[PDB]
Amino acid sequence: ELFTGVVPILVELDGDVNGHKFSVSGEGEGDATYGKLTLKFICTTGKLPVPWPTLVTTLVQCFSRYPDHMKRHDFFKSAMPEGYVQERTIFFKDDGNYKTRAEVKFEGDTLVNRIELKGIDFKEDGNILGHKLEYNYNSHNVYIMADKQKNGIKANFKIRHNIEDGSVQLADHYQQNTPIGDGPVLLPDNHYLSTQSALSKDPNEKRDHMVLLEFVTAAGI
Amino acid sequence: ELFTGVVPILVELDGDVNGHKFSVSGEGEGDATYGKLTLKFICTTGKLPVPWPTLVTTLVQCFSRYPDHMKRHDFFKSAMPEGYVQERTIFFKDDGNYKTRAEVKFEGDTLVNRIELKGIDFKEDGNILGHKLEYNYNSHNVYIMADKQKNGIKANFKIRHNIEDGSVQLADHYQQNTPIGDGPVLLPDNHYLSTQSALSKDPNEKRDHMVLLEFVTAAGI
């Protein structure tokens, strides 16, 4: 399996929110055998317009650990190596909305994720815009459902971003995944993904960035 | 400063809850310059009676990153290397209570934490006892207050443990810290600690354990 060893991963995300241009290149490693991911992200254009944590779900579920018995419901890796397209509608509570389409497929030996993030409605008084979210993250449950007609998968899970004043900024997700090829895929039984993410820094990096440690496991069935 | 480089850390915790004996030895590294800690914990007696995550706050705030301006309010490192005693009363919602006294001081070059955990009231139908908490963690705010008469510090913060059915198991903390010596200490201005913790596993370990990555930062003043 492509994921028996450790896999290199690169991330190209191009964003635009309320007209502000920005680009983030990510790179790292991910061991699927343990639902553990590792990545460094540079705001390649300069100064990230929107907070780093608010972009975490956009910056590869094909790296989660799917126990041996659930191995038949791992659609993400079913998709491989032709990849899968992931589209998302994110709703941050009482502020705007992110819209993202991504292409994550094998580009050689290095798993490549390519995103285009669009965003609108962001208030110049809101937590998102006025950088009020704390640099950290919590844990969540990402629920998946086999969209049978579309041969892909469906996801809807919610994220809570903490604001400097404890306040819990809510991020509703509307996630759709569809294979990129015709190599028959794996519709799965309803199950969820328990993620753990820790955003952090780098003493060495003088460039605007984010450092993220992810530990994900398929649990459910 | 003892914490300019990376510091070795060992942890001896001896527990007893509802009469069940158990022991966990922890060992790892911690870079204070970045509020980053790293530790591996073995249930040395065999099978951890109570869930691993429910013991995370018991298993070294002296490793958090205190920005340069807040450097005068770092009591934990003020305590060094004579250490500090930490006592805790933990209340897990609609179940029992953990009581812990610890000794964390420099034992050579390796920072040593020594805990004795006592617990009672744990229901044989409760989330704690019947292992219903998910293996992960969220992020929190640990609030500190200079107890002036006691020359120590005071803390009260709350933890939310997720249960397999999403349910949020609540853990009230009553934290008291007091210097172990007479080397004048640092009473601090009210401030908080933003922690990020990720529990994980080890393919290699056949012994009952927990793996934890912590990223902590003093923010507040």
Q: How far is the alpha carbon of B21 from chain A, nearest alpha carbon, in Å?
A: 30
Q: How far is the alpha carbon of A96 from chain B, nearest alpha carbon, in Å?
A: 24
Task: Please name the residue that has the structure tokens 């640092």.
Answer: B186
Asked if residues A160 and A173 have their Cβ atoms less than 8 Å apart, the reply is no
Positions of chain breaks in chain A, given as the residue before each break (C to N > 2.5 Å):
59
Q: How far apart are CA B38 and CA B29, in angstroms?
A: 5
User: Taking the C-alpha atoms of B120, B125, B127 and B130 in order, what is their torsion angle to the nearest 10 degrees?
Assistant: 90
Chain B residues with CB-CB distance to A196 below 8 A: 136-137, 198-200
DSSP A59-122: --GGGSB--TGGGGG-HHHHHTTS-EEEEEEEEETTS-EEEEEEEEEEETTEEEEEEEEEEE--
φ, ψ at A123 (rounded to 5°): -65, 135
Asked if residues A221 and A66 have their Cβ atoms less than 8 Å apart, the reply is no
Smallest CA-to-CA distance from A120 within A18, A23, A4 is with A18
Strand partners, B143: B192
Determine how many CB atoms are found less than 10 A away from the CB of residue A202.
12
Q: Cβ–Cβ of B194/A134 closer than 8 Å?
A: yes
Collapsed DSSP state (helix, strand, coil) of residue A137: coil
Task: Please name the residue that has the structure tokens 């030996």.
Answer: A109
Q: Measured on CA atoms in the order B158, B159, B162, B163, is the torsion positive or negative?
A: negative
Q: Tell me the HSE value of A93 on the side-chain side, using a 13 A CA sphere.
A: 13
Q: How far apart are CA B121 and CA B94, in angstroms?
A: 9
Task: Please name the residue that has the structure tokens 């927990």.
Answer: B210
Collapsed DSSP state (helix, strand, coil) of residue A34: helix
Asked if residues A203 and B33 have their Cβ atoms less than 8 Å apart, the reply is yes
- Method used experimentally: X-ray
Chain B residues with CB-CB distance to A195 below 8 A: 136
φ, ψ at B70 (rounded to 5°): -85, -5
What is the total count of domains within chain A?
A: 1
Q: How far apart are CA B59 and CA B17, in angstroms?
A: 16
Q: Cβ–Cβ of A137/B134 closer than 8 Å?
A: no
- State the SS3 of chain B: CCCCCEEEEEEEEEEEECCEEEEEEEEEEEEHHHCEEEEEEEECCCCCCCCCHHHCCCCCHHHCECCCHHHHHCHHHHHCCCCEEEEEEEEECCCCEEEEEEEEEEECCEEEEEEEEEEECCCCCCCCCCCCECCCCCEEEEEEECCCCCCCEEECCEEEEEECCCCEEEEEEEEEEEECCCCCCCCCCCEEEEEEEEEECCCCCCCCEEEEEEEEEEECC
Chain A residues with CB-CB distance to B200 below 8 A: 34, 36, 196, 215
The CATH number that applies at residue A46 is 2.40.155.10
Collapsed DSSP state (helix, strand, coil) of residue A32: helix
Copy the structure tokens of residue B53.
């995550």
Q: How far apart are CA B212 and CA B24, in angstroms?
A: 14
Which of B4, B63, B136 to probe by mutation at the A interface, max A CB count within 10 Å?
Answer: B136
If you measure CA to CA, which chain A residue comes closest to B203? A34
Positions of chain breaks in chain B, given as the residue before each break (C to N > 2.5 Å):
59
Q: Which residues 6+ apart lie within 8 Å of A206 measured at CB?
A: none
Q: Which member of B138, B195, B200 has the closest CB to residue A215?
A: B200
Q: Cβ–Cβ of B34/A197 closer than 8 Å?
A: no
Taking every pair of C-alpha atoms in chain A, what is the biggest distance, in angstroms? Answer: 49
User: Letter for the amino acid at B188?
Assistant: P
Residue range of the domain that includes B204: 1-221
Q: How far apart are CA B110 and CA B125, in angstroms?
A: 40
Asked if residues B203 and A39 have their Cβ atoms less than 8 Å apart, the reply is no
Q: How far apart are CA B40 and CA B77, in angstroms?
A: 23
Q: How far apart are CA A11 and CA A60, in angstroms?
A: 10
Rounded to a whole number of angstroms, the distance between the first and last alpha carbons of chain B is 22
The 8-class DSSP code of residue A128 comes to T
